[PDB]
Amino acid sequence: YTRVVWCAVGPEEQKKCQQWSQQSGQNVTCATASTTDDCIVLVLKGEADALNLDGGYIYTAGKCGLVPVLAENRKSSKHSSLDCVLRPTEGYLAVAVVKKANEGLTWNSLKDKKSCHTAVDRTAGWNIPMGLIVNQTGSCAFDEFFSQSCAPGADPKSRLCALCAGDDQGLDKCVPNSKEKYYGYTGAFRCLAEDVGDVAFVKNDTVWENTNGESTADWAKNLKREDFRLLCLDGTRKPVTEAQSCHLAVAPNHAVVSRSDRAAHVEQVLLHQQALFGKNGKNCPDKFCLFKSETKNLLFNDNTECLAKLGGRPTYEEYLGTEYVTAIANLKKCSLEACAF
Numbered sequence: 001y002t003r004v005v006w007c008a009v010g011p012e013e014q015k016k017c018q019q020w021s022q023q024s025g026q027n028v029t030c031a032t033a034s035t036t037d038d039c040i041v042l043v044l045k046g047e048a049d050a051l052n053l054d055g056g057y058i059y060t061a062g063k064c065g066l067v068p069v070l071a072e073n074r075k076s077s078k079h080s081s082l083d084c085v086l087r088p089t090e091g092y093l094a095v096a097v098v099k100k101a102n103e104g105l106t107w108n109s110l111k112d113k114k115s116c117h118t119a120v121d122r123t124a125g126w127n128i129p130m131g132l133i134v135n136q137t138g139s140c141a142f143d144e145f146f147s148q149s150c151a152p153g154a155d156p157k158s159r160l161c162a163l164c165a166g167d168d169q170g171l172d173k174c175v176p177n178s179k180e181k182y183y184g185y186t187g188a189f190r191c192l193a194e195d196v197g198d199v200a201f202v203k204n205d206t207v208w209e210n211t212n213g214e215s216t217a218d219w220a221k222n223l224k225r226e227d228f229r230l231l232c233l234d235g236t237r238k239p240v241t242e243a244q245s246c247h248l249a250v251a252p253n254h255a256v257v258s259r260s261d262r263a264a265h266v267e268q269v270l271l272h273q274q275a276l277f278g279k280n281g282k283n284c285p286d287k288f289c290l291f292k293s294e295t296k297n298l299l300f301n302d303n304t305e306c307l308a309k310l311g312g313r314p315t316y317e318e319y320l321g322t323e324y325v326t327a328i329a330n331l332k333k334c335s336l337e338a339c340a341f
């Protein structure tokens with residue numbers, strides 16, 4: 001009744017979820033699926049209650065009647081007066097990132113280069129950059145723009161998966177879960193850093209979190225911010241310090257979603273879980289921390305300070321905003337109102 005079933009995507013989220021479940025005295029239990037879409041289907045059936053979604057997936061889920069419940073909020077320099085839970089969310093910066101050493105690569109010379117995407121259907125990794133590229137090219141053949149990519153969730157035999165690596169054993173090439181080596185923000189940035197691709201479509205925060213000693217992960221140990229450049233829409237290249245003047249869009253924060261009839265109960269439970277396991281929680285450093293997973297963004301983004309109440313009790317369309325929503329609608333007309341399942 002007052003027990004919430006979390007949906008985990010893939011085996012590593014399942015493991016973190018199992019630890020959370022144990023620590024919460026089974027106030028939270030876990031269902032697992034191989035993809036985010038499969039998790040949304042579990043929620044629709046009533047077999048799971050909730051999961052934290054990227055903006056692009058909130059759009060999929062919303063068309064099926066799921067609703068935003070609480071949003072990730074990270075640290076801000078403005079609005080510092082208000083408590084984290086009550087503070088408005090700011091949104092993250094979607095950016096395109098290249099190596100400094102790859103000279104003369106600009107936004108206007110991306111055609112036939114190698115790209116690294118978080119996953120198909122995601123905001124910074126897919127919807128924003130491909131929407132821009134479709135508009136600019138006047139063509140829906142975005143699968144022929146780049147010579148080779150890693151875009152988890154695309155056909156494994158296509159060029160959109162050519163650069164994906166799969167797991168330790170080479171299995172699960174291009175699956176949109178953290179088994180794929182180049183999945184997610186961190187995976188797409190790794191694909192760039194290892195020089196598999198020429199450009200990575202990620203958010204501003206990923207670059208900072210994985211450079212200048214901020215990670216310690218073996219591939220990121222020695223990465224320096226100065227070795228990277230952002231691509232701006234005016235054809236220039238800028239240091240990573242200038243993302244406020246050199247980004248592709250501001251994205252709505254990742255948010256917990258649930259079935260409408262469950263929303264109120266999911267919200268109550270999660271507010272109490274973060275008091276126990278969130279940033280300054282009673283049990284975090286000691287027993288368990290909800291918002292940590294060694295740079296791997298499992299369940300929630302590691303930079304999350306708290307989950308925030310929404311206010312204006314927004315629908316999915318209001319939460320995402322009219323800007324972003326019409327961008328996805330236009331791109332989706334390349335690949336009609338209804339749930340996708």
Ligand SMILES: *[C@@H]1O[C@H](CO)[C@@H](O[C@@H]2O[C@H](CO)[C@@H](O[C@H]3O[C@H](CO)[C@@H](O[C@@H]4O[C@H](CO)[C@@H](O[C@H]5O[C@H](CO)[C@@H](O[C@@H]6O[C@H](CO)[C@@H](O)[C@H](O)[C@@H]6O)[C@H](O)[C@@H]5O)[C@H](O)[C@@H]4O)[C@H](O)[C@@H]3O)[C@H](O)[C@H]2NC(C)=O)[C@H](O)[C@H]1NC(C)=O
Nearest residue numbers: 075076077078080093204205206208209214242243244303
């Ligand atoms: C791209 O992504 C990166 C990564 O996410 C991001 O950089 C991070 O941004 C955070 C800032 O928003 C960084 O700050 C945090 O970490 C520092 C560690 O050094 C901590 O140190 C202090 O924290 C205190 C308390 O919060 C700060 O004091 C606050 O209060 C004062 C009141 O006087 C205010 O200062 C003012 O700030 C304004 C606006 O910036 C400035 O113009 C004024 O001149 C004035 O000085 C302000 O409210 C302060 O926050 C104190 O100043 C220190 O910050 C904190 O805990 C802090 O929260 C975080 O470290 C960054 N991460 C990393 C890894 O580098 C980028 O911002 C992002 N870029 C874009 C464009 O979004």
Ligand SMILES: *[C@@H]1O[C@H](CO)[C@@H](O[C@@H]2O[C@H](CO)[C@@H](O[C@@H]3O[C@H](CO[C@@H]4O[C@H](CO)[C@@H](O)[C@H](O)[C@@H]4O)[C@@H](O[C@H]4O[C@H](CO)[C@@H](O)[C@H](O)[C@@H]4O)[C@H](O)[C@@H]3O)[C@H](O)[C@H]2NC(C)=O)[C@H](O)[C@H]1NC(C)=O
Nearest residue numbers: 127128129130131132134135322323324326327328330331
């Ligand atoms: C790829 O290209 C496509 C096609 O161009 C883009 O889709 C278009 O995006 C436009 C920008 O979002 C969009 O423009 C319209 O803008 C109006 C006005 O926006 C207003 O903002 C005001 C803030 O000052 C605010 O006061 C207003 O309330 C309002 O929000 C929006 O309203 C119009 O629509 C009404 C339709 O009946 C009309 O009555 C009214 O007078 C306005 O004209 C409107 O919703 C819309 O956002 C445009 O509609 C989109 N075009 C098409 C054909 O769909 C994508 O964004 C591009 N992709 C990317 C990633 O950039």
Ligand SMILES: *[C@@H]1O[C@H](CO)[C@@H](O[C@@H]2O[C@H](CO)[C@@H](O)[C@H](O)[C@H]2NC(C)=O)[C@H](O)[C@H]1NC(C)=O
Nearest residue numbers: 002003022023024025026027028269272273276
């Ligand atoms: C699991 O959830 C329960 C229910 O919310 C928590 O126990 C409740 O504690 C509150 C006050 O803190 C009481 O008002 C309720 O009576 C309790 N519920 C019942 C029926 O036991 C409990 O703290 C949670 N446990 C953990 C570790 O998260």
Ligand SMILES: C[C@@H]1O[C@@H](O)[C@H](O)[C@H](O)[C@H]1O
Nearest residue numbers: 087088089309310311319
């Ligand atoms: C936290 C939440 O975030 C967005 O939905 C809006 O900016 C809104 O104003 C705020 O309440």
Ligand SMILES: [Fe+3]
Nearest residue numbers: 054055123124
């Ligand atoms: Fe995202």
Ligand SMILES: [Zn+2]
Nearest residue numbers: 247248249250
């Ligand atoms: Zn902007």
Ligand SMILES: [Zn+2]
Nearest residue numbers: 312314315318
């Ligand atoms: Zn409303």
